[model samples]
Target: SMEQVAMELRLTELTRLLRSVLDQLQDKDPARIFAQPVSLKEVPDYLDHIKHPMDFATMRKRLEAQGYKNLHEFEEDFDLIIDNCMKYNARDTVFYRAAVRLRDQGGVVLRQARREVDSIG
Candidate 1:
């Protein structure tokens, strides 16, 4: 089933992200888990924002052409990929696992980015 396949891939990506974060945290001192709770509803909305790889690739290339150098410049594209993986497919256990892991990390990442934005302002 294509839906099943998409869901599995999505979970795999999320799990991979969680594992990477854990590994990074291990390298540095363990980081604090942000105190605010994560909402499950945002998962679908985030996924909804990024559903097409072709579109993502196109945007990434455009950014690169415009001299967006750091890989972090492509953060939005990466986020869209994660979102599309979950949204285009139906919900299941795999989806929940991935969603939970992402929510945990996403909140932290988003807040950090917001801080950068605030500093720049």
Candidate 2:
């Protein structure tokens, strides 16, 4: 289910890392608000501002599709989630602080994921 070189066996690691990230994010959002896409009905203007919105509900499908040939593509969406939260939610907002802390710890997890893969080849 993985290539022999390049991303290589790390493909397995990528899938594992993706799930790990998702699980942790899920754990943080007990309300499941962050687990799903931002609602347009709640605020129609939300869609107007953010150019690229990232949502977890859709991400699993992205995972199902196995989108992103390499890790960077996955990381792009990962960061976009936090980015959208930070931008849409202002300073002192609920989502802002959570995303701030969320991104804070996420950095470490991905590093280990990447580090683990770096040694696989």
Candidate 3:
């Protein structure tokens, strides 16, 4: 179980990194639209538009469960929420613009964290 402990220890850094990233992403979303799952009632056509919808709340849940095996998995969810926004909303809309910034600015944040040397020692 020593290896298991080592794995979890390394995971601590990832968990902390993801938490702060979530905070920044939440901060970027002043509208609070991405905080929770999208309402199918409000936009009946949303389900049809977005095949794999993702959001902050769900991301946090996955984080708590330790669903991510590595940084790539975590990054996937980050890109997924942004992708869903752009895919559903038009380029001229506010939602689309916000997604772009997240992909650009928020993405840079993730990239920087990934570059940092992650170790258990």
Model 1 regions lying over 4 Å from their true place? 1-51, 54-75
Predictions: Cα RMSD each? 16.2, 3.0, 2.0
List, residue by residue over 43-68, the lDDT tens digit for candidate 3: 98888888888899999999888676
Model 3 regions more than 4 Å off? 117-121
In the range 17-76, model 2's lDDT, one tens digit per residue, is: 677766776666665656888878887998888999887777777876656556677778
What local lDDT does model 2 show for residue 87? 92
Residue 121, candidate 3: Cα error in Å is 8.5
lDDT of 1 by residue, 39-114 (tens): 3465446434543442333543454344333335445644543455456545775543454465566557656554
**Candidate number achieving the greatest lDDT relative to the actual structure:** 3
Which lDDT value does model 2 have at 104? 81
Q: Can you give the lDDT of residue 69 in candidate 2?
A: 58
* Model 2 regions more than 4 Å off: 1-13
